[PDB]
Design a protein around this ligand. Structure first.
Ligand code: O3D
Ligand code: CL
Ligand code: ZN
Ligand code: ZN
Length: 571
């Protein structure tokens, strides 16, 4: 324990040995406190706001732009029968994910090419773009790397504000060892059967409708209360078994990431009473957001297969598994495992399960004992399922079935329109020029044109923003992002919804936006549309005046009018 984290702690001390003090009034109970040392928001996108004036008086939109007692919790060790179910399932799942994939190291080359097209996700030269073009950094990385091969760690200590930052070198070593899970699509639907990694928001609805076609009971979508805080050391150990599929240097590098950074963590914390606190713990999730996604999907897939086992009565008690209750679990996985993975859609901590029948709803003992406690339902109260795939929540959306005038079927993503408008009115960071603010507006607008075209207010506002931003300016931003392009949005729409759509047999291109349908007017209102309000009618009618206000601010540039794409403006 202390031999694994001592060097990291003993190092930090020496750099701040002029301010080192052990505070006896430290708030940490579940975290292990070591010492302290002296130490010391969302902006509005004006292009999007000026083109969404009716929403300036909608509190659900305007409040979105204004403005750690769970991270300090302790999970209990699972029973021996639980631990046995988890180890057997995890061993079988890594083998299945491994059947058509080859674990491999990710490279400095790959890591470099990622930072040079924006991929900063909790990091600590000025920027990471600079550090990667300087071999001094890479000598630091070499020093840490040879230390890992030696079963030791020096400079992999997280920074917590909960989001866990880590210095680029440690990030690199994590990417080198574990990047392959994301980079080679271990969690693709084709490869993992439950997964949706890389699927895209235009595919998730078709995937849920495919799950719905299976014979079985209700669709269950239970959210876990604080999934990252409920990751046990037993979970971390089952995740580590991916190294059993590796070899040579790779196996050793990955083993070190798991042992030294995941299973034996150390973290920096700002406390204003302002000291920096140095704390440690073994359990819970603390990795890069991208390795966190993949390992969340894995452990969630494992947990949901075990809950399906409990529902089907493959085992009777989590307290202890009989010898013949391991042969039967193993037989179940070999016999039906792949079929049961196909009954699920899993995106990290988020899941939809269509089990064999509704016994699943009251099968709670393994799920509770693994620590995956359901959010906003009493611990022993049976789950409430959905009868209609169009009502199931998944990845912050629901999905509509929308029939085109030509009879072809679209399955479209949707959420409350206040959420969509409120997010598009927000920018992250400082130093935004007018041009950069405009190009972020255009990214939102082209997303809305591709994903949310069926919402009357979003097609109109999308058209208005693309009319107000210079035609050739490139969309920016600091699933699959097909809207991030200067290509014509009708050509992109045809590629995504017709040409490349495996659920669409007839490949006849759509020739205008007028052939692309909306939700029913009543359904559009239910999902938050302002259609029918006086504020919205005056906005729609006078839209060219709003477009002209923004064009005057940006100045004398080349613009296109996209409003004639809509019938009411085609005049
Ligand atoms: O890593 S950072 O970009 C984000 C966190 N901040 C403050 C912080 C919290 C804990 C330790 O340090 C440092 C710079
Ligand atoms: Cl329902
Ligand atoms: Zn290290
Ligand atoms: Zn909807």
């Amino acid at each position: 324990n202390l031999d694994i984290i001592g060097k990291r702690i003993e190092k930090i001390k020496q750099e701040h040995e002029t301010s080192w003090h052990y505070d006896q009034d430290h708030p940490y109970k579940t975290w292990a406190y070591h010492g302290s040392y002296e130490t010391k928001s969302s902006m509005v996108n004006g292009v999007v706001r000026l083109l969404t004036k009716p929403w300036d008086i909608i509190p659900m939109v305007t409040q979105m732009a204004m403005t750690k007692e769970k991270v300090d919790t302790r999970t209990q060790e699972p029973k021996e029968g639980t631990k046995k179910l988890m180890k057997i399932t995890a061993e079988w799942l890594w083998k299945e994910l491994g059947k058509k994939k080859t674990p491999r190291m990710c490279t400095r080359e790959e890591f470099t090419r990622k930072v040079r097209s924006n991929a900063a996700l909790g990091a600590i030269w000025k920027s990471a773009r600079e550090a990667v073009e300087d071999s001094g950094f890479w000598e630091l990385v070499d020093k840490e790397r040879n230390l890992h091969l030696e079963g030791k760690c020096e400079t992999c200590v997280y920074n917590m504000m909960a989001i866990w930052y880590m210095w680029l070198g440690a990030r690199f070593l994590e990417f080198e060892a574990l990047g392959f899970l994301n980079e080679d699509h271990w969690f693709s639907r084709e490869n993992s059967l439950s997964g949706v990694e890389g699927e895209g928001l235009h595919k998730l609805g078709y995937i849920l409708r495919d799950v719905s076609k299976k014979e079985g009971g209700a669709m269950y979508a239970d959210d876990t209360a604080g999934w990252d805080t409920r990751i046990t050391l037993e979970d971390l150990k089952n995740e580590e078994m991916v190294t059993n599929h590796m070899e040579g240097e790779h196996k050793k590098l990955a083993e070190a990431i798991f042992k030294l950074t995941y299973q034996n963590k150390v973290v920096r914390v700002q406390r204003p009473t302002t000291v920096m606190d140095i704390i440690s713990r073994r359990d819970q999730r603390g990795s890069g957001q991208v390795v966190t996604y993949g390992l969340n999907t894995f452990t969630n897939m494992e947990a949901q297969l075990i809950r399906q086992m409990e529902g089907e009565g493959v085992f009777k008690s989590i307290q202890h598994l009989t010898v013949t209750e391991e042969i039967a679990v193993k037989n179940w996985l070999v016999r039906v495992g792949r079929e049961r993975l196909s009954r699920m859609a899993i995106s990290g901590d988020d899941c939809v399960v269509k089990p064999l029948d509704d016994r699943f709803a009251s099968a709670l003992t393994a799920l509770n004992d693994m620590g995956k406690v359901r959010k906003d339902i009493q611990q022993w109260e049976p789950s409430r399922g959905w009868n209609d795939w169009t009502q199931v929540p998944f990845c912050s959306h629901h999905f509509h079935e929308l029939i085109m005038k030509d009879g072809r079927v679209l399955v479209v993503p949707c959420r409350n329109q206040d959420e969509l408008i409120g997010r598009a009115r927000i920018s992250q960071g400082a130093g935004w020029s007018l041009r950069e603010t405009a190009c972020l507006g255009k990214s939102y607008a082209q997303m809305w044109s591709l994903m949310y075209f069926h919402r009357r207010d979003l097609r109109l506002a999308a058209n208005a923003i693309c009319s107000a931003v210079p035609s050739h300016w490139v969309p920016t931003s600091r699933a699959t992002h097909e809207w991030m392009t200067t290509e014509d949005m009708l050509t992109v729409w045809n590629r995504v919804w017709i040409q490349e759509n495996p659920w669409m047999e007839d490949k006849t291109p759509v020739e205008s936006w007028e052939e692309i349908p909306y939700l029913g007017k009543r359904e559009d209102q239910w999902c938050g549309s302002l259609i029918g309000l006086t504020s919205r009618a005056t906005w729609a009618k006078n839209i060219q005046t709003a477009i002209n206000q923004v064009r005057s601010l940006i100045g004398n540039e080349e613009y296109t009018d996209y409003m004639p794409s809509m019938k009411r403006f085609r005049r």
